[PDB]
């Protein structure tokens, strides 16, 4: 058995590891939407930017649950990543829209895991939830509703003028 | 014969001397192109700045091809510049559209090139075009294309502001 | 049809599309491995570090070909990507072998399209292959044959020691 | 009819146009220059870089001469750029000789034109060529007609020592 | 069998042990010509200077292959290094006649090399050479030819004058 | 007969020109054995760079006997240059007794050709070599008895241990 392990259950361990696959999931679909919008009949830099850097995030969380899965004693166990769900992404409004449903299944998963954790008396891994992740991914959502107001109330009758002013005066571009 | 000149085929010579007319002709195309977008009654000095630099940056391409020239033995022959085709270059949708089709004719030229220097065993050729042209040239034509897709965006039912806001939110200016 | 592609054949595009996945399965196996040398009873620091850098570096390889197909105008299309081919990774020996055997695979796909983009007279592909990975994989297969040299020297009699040697005294770490 | 054009006559424009073609003309010609003495069996250093800076110059001119026409609101016309009058220059003395040649011709041009403006009571157009043309070209012609000088005296019976000579000694070179 | 050997011939393996040898004897005859022109009798401080620079780069050169012959995974072997084929050298033209003599002897086994590489599809070989050694060679051959060129201006009727001329007013010296 | 030459007998000169040749090719000897340690299969990268380091030097050594002969007057001769001993060197001992063998052969060379110059009343001659090589030969030895004995200490019954730890921990590495 393992030296170090105490308190850590095979349900958490196993949730771990699932939670870690959904990450990465998640930073494939980011990475899919950034080179979607670096398309040459797309074009939105900004909307490029905005998805590269929310895939290098959520890599950066599925190792942070990586390395405590290590710190307590549970195996990392990784399986196939499936594919973004969409080959091409339709428009800022529509990715936008994908990646607020994304995070919420995320989010879901963080909750239900810390449900488990609390069940489980661990208070290490419900405190590493928390500290971590539970309260990024509420900024996260609260920045995306922003997003898709803002990009809602530019349609109007001239959709691709606000979508390129979306792009050009809200997100970050060189 | 050449004191130099080694594994240099004459028709090497003659299709360097024929790029130097290609882009001395395309950075002409760019000065013209680049003063129309100066003109009181176009007045688009993003546009302006843009031609202009692409007419710098196509006499150093073909003062680069001259020195190569010069260090493989060959001779700089020039020939007639024929002006541009247009006099006046219409909206900056047209202008962008003109600048991409004489940037596939100019890679269109060095590819040939290539091949030929493929044919003739000329790796040093080859590398040369691969080193300072073949890249810059994909990429300005990436540039290009991602610049055209937000002019037709922008066309809407608002010609004149989306030109305005594309010059001043795209281009760079002062 | 797209406003931008020049010289870039349906067979190439695919193929790049192919390596991209072989980049990221790459990286996905040297996440893999660097976890498992973090396990606690494992514990080769040095190893990880090791690992985990390749992992990073296989993901920037395959974002660069990714912006390159942009450039070229074909279009990036994911795949799923399979897990690693363990789940333990045996000793810091058996380790570098499985990696030794990643990069020629890898090679060898770099090779293969190295010579698709040769028939079909395409030499921006070449090109940024030669520039961007051959020599990097050249360079990386010589280190860890290098690596695998020095572990099969310290086994002798003494595989413990000599595990923990190397990982000290060769490989970087804190 | 123009919204700024005042006070600037179609033959003052259309004069304007000419002198473009004549500096974007004398540029070429300086392009030639310099690249011929760059040749590997001419090697004079010196004399290829007096040539080439001097063709940047000229191309600078026809540039403030296309600033001024818009400025006033004239048209810029671009015509054919005649190819230089020679492929092979001769000695350094037979370059300057033929130097001073093109630079009094587009004197002449300058004092025509402002003649003109005199004329046609153009005080503007009097004012431009002045304070940018009139007095450099005249120093340009004073330092060739001192090159020249120096360059006959060292003739002598041992041209190619006077031609080395020159070069190193009167002219800016690595 | 090699642990990292892939895509490397062993005509190519053979052709580079080869070419290491002619490098170094390029070093040895450069070596030869510093010292020569060192001699009180000769005296030739920036011809010594300009030959035993020479011999240290194409020292360097031996010195990359060697290296990526074993990141190759081939084997170096080295042969007797033939001494140069004269003892005195002549004149700074007789020395710089038999420099660009040796240099497109030394360019044509690079240009060999390079076409076997090609035919036997291993791109490794062509790129390493482009990067490391042709260009280099082209714009050392020009510079010889340039050189040579100026020598022969100067000879006139008075070689000696010439000659200290040439070595005062070109060749860098102290 | 030679300006400058003084008490510089044509003993002395033909044995300087010999010790030239014997230096160089212990230069020969020292890249060679530098660039097995290099080979993939050997990998101790501290004994490679002992090793070429001491070909820098021996290469150095050449250079101011030949420096000294032109001083004197004598005149410099080129032999063919030996290839070294052995194509592969074996193990860091093996190569280290290899190197000491070298290097009494070197320095009986500089002694007899001490002893030549104080027989012929060469004061010139027995200062030089006392100055620039005697004292750097015998603690180039010393260093390398040192280096001998530690590496028969580590050989024990873990010949591979010891020959890492030797290069780890006594020869300088990156
Ligand atoms: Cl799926
Ligand atoms: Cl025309
Ligand atoms: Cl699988
Ligand atoms: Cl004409
Ligand atoms: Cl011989
Ligand atoms: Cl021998």
Not at 88 to 93: A, D, I, N, P, V
Not at 105 to 119: F, V
């Amino acid at each position: 058995s393992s030296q170090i392990r105490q308190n850590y259950s095979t349900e958490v361990e196993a949730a771990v590891n699932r939670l870690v696959n959904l990450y990465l999931r998640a930073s494939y679909t980011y990475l899919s939407l950034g080179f979607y919008f670096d398309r040459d009949d797309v074009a939105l830099e900004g909307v490029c930017h905005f998805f590269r850097h929310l895939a290098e995030h959520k890599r950066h969380g599925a190792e942070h649950l990586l390395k405590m899965q290590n710190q307590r004693g549970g195996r990392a166990l990784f399986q196939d990543l499936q594919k973004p769900s969409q080959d091409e992404w339709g428009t800022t409004l529509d990715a936008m829209k994908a990646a607020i449903v994304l995070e919420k299944s995320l989010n879901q998963a963080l909750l239900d895991l810390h449900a488990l954790g609390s069940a489980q008396a661990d208070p290490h891994l419900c405190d590493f939830l928390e500290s971590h992740f539970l309260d990024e991914e509420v900024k996260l959502i609260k920045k995306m509703g922003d997003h898709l107001t803002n990009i809602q109330r530019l349609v109007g009758s001239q959709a691709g003028l606000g979508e390129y002013l979306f792009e050009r005066l809200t997100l970050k571009h060189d």
